Amino acid sequence: FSALEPLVDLPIGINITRFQTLLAYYVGY
């Protein structure tokens, strides 16, 4: 068990539909 702290908040105002990772990693939803 772990807790994830908010560090960075970005008021971008842009829609995000996809993402990709730059370079083992795990992706959930």
Place this chain on the structure above:
Amino acid sequence: ATVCGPKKSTNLVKNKCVNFNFNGLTGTGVLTESNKKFLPFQQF
């Protein structure tokens, strides 16, 4: 929004019944010092 105006700050007065405006939230109370430990992201 991004470009908001300036926001002034008054002097912090302790041990009095005062009307506080700590950031956005307001209220009426007596601000005394405490021994509580916040996390560094937690404001309230």
